[PDB]
Amino acid sequence: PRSLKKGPFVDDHLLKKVDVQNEKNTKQVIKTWSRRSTIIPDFIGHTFAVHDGRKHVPVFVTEAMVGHKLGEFAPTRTFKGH
Amino acid sequence: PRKGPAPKRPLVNDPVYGSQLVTQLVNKVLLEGKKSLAERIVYGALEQAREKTGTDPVVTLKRALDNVKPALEVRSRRVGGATYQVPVEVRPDRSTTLALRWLVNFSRQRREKTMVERLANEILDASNGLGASVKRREDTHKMAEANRAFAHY
Amino acid sequence: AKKSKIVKNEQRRELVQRYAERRAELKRTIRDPASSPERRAAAVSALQRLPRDSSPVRLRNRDVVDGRPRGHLRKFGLSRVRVREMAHRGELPGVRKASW
Amino acid sequence: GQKINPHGFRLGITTEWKSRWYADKQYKDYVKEDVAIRKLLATGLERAGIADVEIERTRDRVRVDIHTARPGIVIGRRGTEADRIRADLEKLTGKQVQLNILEVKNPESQAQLVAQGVAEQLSNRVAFRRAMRKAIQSAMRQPNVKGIRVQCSGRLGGAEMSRSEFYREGRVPLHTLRADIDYGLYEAKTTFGRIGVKVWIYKGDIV
RNA sequence: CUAAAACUCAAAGGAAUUGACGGGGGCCCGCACAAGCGGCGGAGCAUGUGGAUUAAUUCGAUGCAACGCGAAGAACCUUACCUGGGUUUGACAUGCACAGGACGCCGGCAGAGAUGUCGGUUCCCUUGUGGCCUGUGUGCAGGUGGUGCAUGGCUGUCGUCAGCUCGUGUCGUGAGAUGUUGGGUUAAGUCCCGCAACGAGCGCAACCCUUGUCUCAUGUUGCCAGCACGUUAUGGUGGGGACUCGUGAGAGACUGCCGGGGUCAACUCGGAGGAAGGUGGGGAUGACGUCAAGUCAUCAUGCCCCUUAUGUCCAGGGCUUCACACAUGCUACAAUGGCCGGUACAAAGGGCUGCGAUGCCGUGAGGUGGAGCGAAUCCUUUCAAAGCCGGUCUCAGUUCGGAUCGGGGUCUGCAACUCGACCCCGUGAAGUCGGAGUCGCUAGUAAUCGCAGAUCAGCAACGCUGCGGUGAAUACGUUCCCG
């Protein structure tokens, strides 16, 4: 995991996106490409359209899933069985 | 060995017993080059045998060797495009080597909780004619006898 | 290998010398001491804004002429294939076959 | 692969290095400009047979000594060729670079020159066997030349199948260290591809 | 017994030559077998491959001689594959032209970025124009696109085996034969004796490196034996070539000598001397060629193909997918051991924007800090582990084994989700020495223990290349197996 000194890594794009999203207390679907961005308690209500590789998966953040990264909730490989 | 026999290594005598046989035994029980540990094991086994019987290690060791020393063996020989189990006379050096190897190997399978105790018990039983090595010698002599008909080639 | 990729490696090197020399190194000095106020400074975020090509982590030691990306030797900057051929021709001073 | 390059086999005993300079921090750029100079001098001059190119470097000043069998072709009577080579050598970041154009004493005891001639004849229309015979017989006349082997490989005669041929005269002990073996390799460009020519020549031994 | 035809084939045949082959013979070799030691095949994990899957799981490599291989370092880059977004004289060269003083940078904005746009900066020649780019272009670039059955170059293998040829001569109508066979000997087509052959070349051997002994030279950063100062902290310090050591030159193994076999010939057995005795030990060196062996993905290249794309830029993903199969390794199944405490010995190698010490802070990765070092000096600790001594465990799926999983951290990197390593706490699977079958090894070898380097920001490293510590058993002999 990332070192504690450096602070959590959140991309600036979706950062300013969520500050402009929460300033009026409305949570519309936000579409992003940065899977590497962690989850901040400022994302508690917002729902992200996180990229997968083909499309964007909708992920509704909760209190439980804070501290993880977005890419956890956008599974890439599709395997059903042989 | 296609061009002839190879020279033999002249192993040296032992410090605390002065006999070739104990040095051969420590070389046989040697593992991974831990010569100090092998010497400790052999010396402890000899001391245990001395304490149990009250006599000198070397004489009872020689008695055990003579008890487990073979004289006839069986080898697979191919004559006329056909293989047989031919009984063969054993040279003294090979008999001593086989006896020591059997002693060590059978002492390694005992259930006396320690190498020193297992070796001491095995050598004492071989001296008294009860060890498993004695049984192996009896079986190999029996097998040599059973195939005596093939002794002519 | 490919001319475009040989060129792009050099372009990374000139980018590195232009940016990683002070811009992508002072931010690291800011982040090193926990005493230094990194969190509000956004030295992490500022250093994200810099191009990826500034980072030397994107560099690749290729053969200085051949462009071969693997089997490289740092002493000569040459591929294993080229070192063998030029050493045999007596081109690298003080190099010869081994025996011991 | 069977035989290593003879020059590298006796590099530390009989033959000498073709570049002479010392560098610790500036070894890489020295090598860069060395190979640039070599390729520039190889591409610029092709009519006169360029036997050898030495480069010496001391700080700013570079001495490039180039050997050819026809010095007049590569040099200018008013210095035109000299001016051209000087100008194109300054542009190679050679700072102050000066050239020593020199001539070989015997231009048929040199393996590189012999391979040059054999390739030039084999290129246009000459049958290869004639090329090797003429080259070998011309080499034997020279006094110091005591052995020669000439070998060519490729689609000889424009055939569909590659072949290798070689002719020898005298002694060529490639395994002997003290004996010096002048070695010359060159690729002749034919309409059907590329033909490789190798020449080994033995002129006595040094101790 | 006499005895056709239709139709079909471009041959069917005889003798002899060179190979190849034989479950034909003869003579020999090689860890080939035999005698041994340790393994694989059974278990968990690492790696590669096949298959399946997928949008893609980039490509090449298929017995020996593919399968810890190209890959001596796939999160991005690498990257050549997929999705999507841009771009076209192009991401990058050089030539013919028109217009120019800007190209170029530096900050802001939008965008995932490529990129687009906004704001400030503006060439020196010298009158002819040159350097820069703009567009307009035009030649052209650019292809890890195809063909290793069109190739060069490079490499593997038979095989470090002893063989492969040529000139002249001679024999045969001819392919071809002799020389190269025969006796002996050798590691060897090595040599001797014979011989329609006489010679020669590439092969063998020697010349090269290292290693084992000694002599001369040699003293710093290396030694310290004899002398002084030392303070514990030691060659640490003044001093000294004496012993090592470092690196220059040289000597020393040449069947040189003796005895015996031997055609008195090669050669062979034994002995003395010597450090070393019979190519001392190990390397480098790989003949003509074979297998259309491998490589158009190190590179080059004939031909074919793309060229508003099969070129080129970017973000994300993939190369890491898994019901299985094969191969190479690591860790184990324990008492010849586990854990704890103490304690002794190496070699080699690396280090400048690198090695990095003392000290301090953490339990520990590690953090702070920077002494000294381009290094026989300083750092890798003074270097190790196995080893030795002491205590404990008492034969159990255990104080063995460590997989898997939960939680908490460090470091690198813009970024450890897919997909890094390491640290701490807890968790504690299979595994009881492994069927048929199979592999390596003849002495400082096998076995076992640790150290270092390349690649490398970090690492998948248990892989590869080297270094040393401790160090065995066995070989009766070529009948069987392989070459």
PDB file of C-alpha atoms in Angstrom, chain B residues 46-106:
ATOM      1  CA  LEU B  46      31.254 -48.051  21.249  1.00  0.00           C
ATOM      2  CA  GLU B  47      31.179 -46.609  24.774  1.00  0.00           C
ATOM      3  CA  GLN B  48      27.556 -47.715  25.211  1.00  0.00           C
ATOM      4  CA  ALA B  49      28.475 -51.238  24.103  1.00  0.00           C
ATOM      5  CA  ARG B  50      31.443 -51.220  26.491  1.00  0.00           C
ATOM      6  CA  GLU B  51      29.244 -50.154  29.402  1.00  0.00           C
ATOM      7  CA  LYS B  52      26.597 -52.760  28.579  1.00  0.00           C
ATOM      8  CA  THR B  53      28.937 -55.725  28.067  1.00  0.00           C
ATOM      9  CA  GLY B  54      31.959 -54.666  30.126  1.00  0.00           C
ATOM     10  CA  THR B  55      34.542 -55.672  27.496  1.00  0.00           C
ATOM     11  CA  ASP B  56      36.504 -53.777  24.867  1.00  0.00           C
ATOM     12  CA  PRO B  57      34.552 -52.264  21.937  1.00  0.00           C
ATOM     13  CA  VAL B  58      36.831 -53.695  19.258  1.00  0.00           C
ATOM     14  CA  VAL B  59      36.565 -57.388  20.153  1.00  0.00           C
ATOM     15  CA  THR B  60      32.759 -57.389  20.213  1.00  0.00           C
ATOM     16  CA  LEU B  61      32.715 -55.265  17.047  1.00  0.00           C
ATOM     17  CA  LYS B  62      34.896 -57.870  15.324  1.00  0.00           C
ATOM     18  CA  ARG B  63      32.659 -60.656  16.637  1.00  0.00           C
ATOM     19  CA  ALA B  64      29.627 -58.873  15.182  1.00  0.00           C
ATOM     20  CA  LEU B  65      31.423 -58.408  11.854  1.00  0.00           C
ATOM     21  CA  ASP B  66      32.397 -62.083  11.688  1.00  0.00           C
ATOM     22  CA  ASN B  67      28.792 -62.958  12.539  1.00  0.00           C
ATOM     23  CA  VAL B  68      27.430 -60.778   9.717  1.00  0.00           C
ATOM     24  CA  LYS B  69      30.286 -61.297   7.242  1.00  0.00           C
ATOM     25  CA  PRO B  70      29.053 -63.097   4.099  1.00  0.00           C
ATOM     26  CA  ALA B  71      31.032 -65.590   2.040  1.00  0.00           C
ATOM     27  CA  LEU B  72      28.721 -66.383  -0.901  1.00  0.00           C
ATOM     28  CA  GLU B  73      26.462 -64.034  -2.854  1.00  0.00           C
ATOM     29  CA  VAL B  74      24.271 -64.037  -5.967  1.00  0.00           C
ATOM     30  CA  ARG B  75      24.891 -61.998  -9.121  1.00  0.00           C
ATOM     31  CA  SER B  76      23.013 -61.723 -12.404  1.00  0.00           C
ATOM     32  CA  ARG B  77      25.243 -63.208 -15.113  1.00  0.00           C
ATOM     33  CA  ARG B  78      24.382 -63.363 -18.818  1.00  0.00           C
ATOM     34  CA  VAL B  79      25.787 -66.407 -20.637  1.00  0.00           C
ATOM     35  CA  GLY B  80      24.680 -67.384 -24.133  1.00  0.00           C
ATOM     36  CA  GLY B  81      22.133 -64.583 -24.344  1.00  0.00           C
ATOM     37  CA  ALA B  82      20.386 -65.678 -21.143  1.00  0.00           C
ATOM     38  CA  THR B  83      20.568 -64.335 -17.595  1.00  0.00           C
ATOM     39  CA  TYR B  84      20.859 -66.421 -14.428  1.00  0.00           C
ATOM     40  CA  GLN B  85      21.349 -65.811 -10.708  1.00  0.00           C
ATOM     41  CA  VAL B  86      24.822 -67.318 -10.284  1.00  0.00           C
ATOM     42  CA  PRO B  87      26.285 -67.795  -6.787  1.00  0.00           C
ATOM     43  CA  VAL B  88      29.701 -66.152  -6.556  1.00  0.00           C
ATOM     44  CA  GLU B  89      32.485 -66.243  -3.988  1.00  0.00           C
ATOM     45  CA  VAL B  90      32.952 -62.946  -2.141  1.00  0.00           C
ATOM     46  CA  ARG B  91      36.382 -61.397  -1.690  1.00  0.00           C
ATOM     47  CA  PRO B  92      37.270 -60.496   1.925  1.00  0.00           C
ATOM     48  CA  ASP B  93      37.208 -56.743   1.271  1.00  0.00           C
ATOM     49  CA  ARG B  94      33.751 -56.940  -0.297  1.00  0.00           C
ATOM     50  CA  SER B  95      32.524 -59.083   2.597  1.00  0.00           C
ATOM     51  CA  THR B  96      33.745 -56.532   5.146  1.00  0.00           C
ATOM     52  CA  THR B  97      32.211 -53.662   3.168  1.00  0.00           C
ATOM     53  CA  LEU B  98      28.873 -55.465   2.864  1.00  0.00           C
ATOM     54  CA  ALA B  99      28.845 -56.358   6.563  1.00  0.00           C
ATOM     55  CA  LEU B 100      29.526 -52.775   7.642  1.00  0.00           C
ATOM     56  CA  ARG B 101      26.967 -51.379   5.193  1.00  0.00           C
ATOM     57  CA  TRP B 102      24.323 -53.828   6.420  1.00  0.00           C
ATOM     58  CA  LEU B 103      25.092 -52.977  10.045  1.00  0.00           C
ATOM     59  CA  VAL B 104      24.738 -49.235   9.451  1.00  0.00           C
ATOM     60  CA  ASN B 105      21.635 -49.515   7.267  1.00  0.00           C
ATOM     61  CA  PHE B 106      19.775 -51.858   9.617  1.00  0.00           C
TER      62      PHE B 106
END
